[PDB]
Design a binder for these strands. Structure first.
Length: 74
RNA sequence: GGUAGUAUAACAAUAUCCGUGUUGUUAUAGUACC
């Protein structure tokens, strides 16, 4: 691997989750290394992911919440 | 003076459950590095 394929994580979440909420935590830093932690809320379970910039944060959250809440989609 | 990052905004392409995302190009600004 190298160029990865996070598009998979995004779409996969969308599939399992036709409607949910994304919310941001942290997001502060020196000036050029901002830490963003975006957490996704599904069915009352909230999973948090930390990325530099907005990209990876929500992404990683999607991955987590996927493996997680698929055990309780209702 | 030059180099760089982050953020906001616009356009296009790509994928798409049309909701959204990824990618590419451009513009503006504090700061950081030399």
């Amino acid at each position: 691997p190298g160029p990865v394929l996070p598009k998979n994580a995004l779409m996969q979440l969308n599939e399992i989750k036709p409607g949910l909420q994304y919310m941001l935590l942290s997001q502060t830093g020196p000036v050029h290394a901002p830490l963003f932690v975006m957490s996704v809320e599904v069915n009352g379970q909230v999973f948090e992911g930390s990325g530099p910039t907005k990209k990876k944060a929500k992404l990683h959250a999607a991955e987590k919440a996927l493996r997680s809440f698929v055990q309780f989609p209702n």
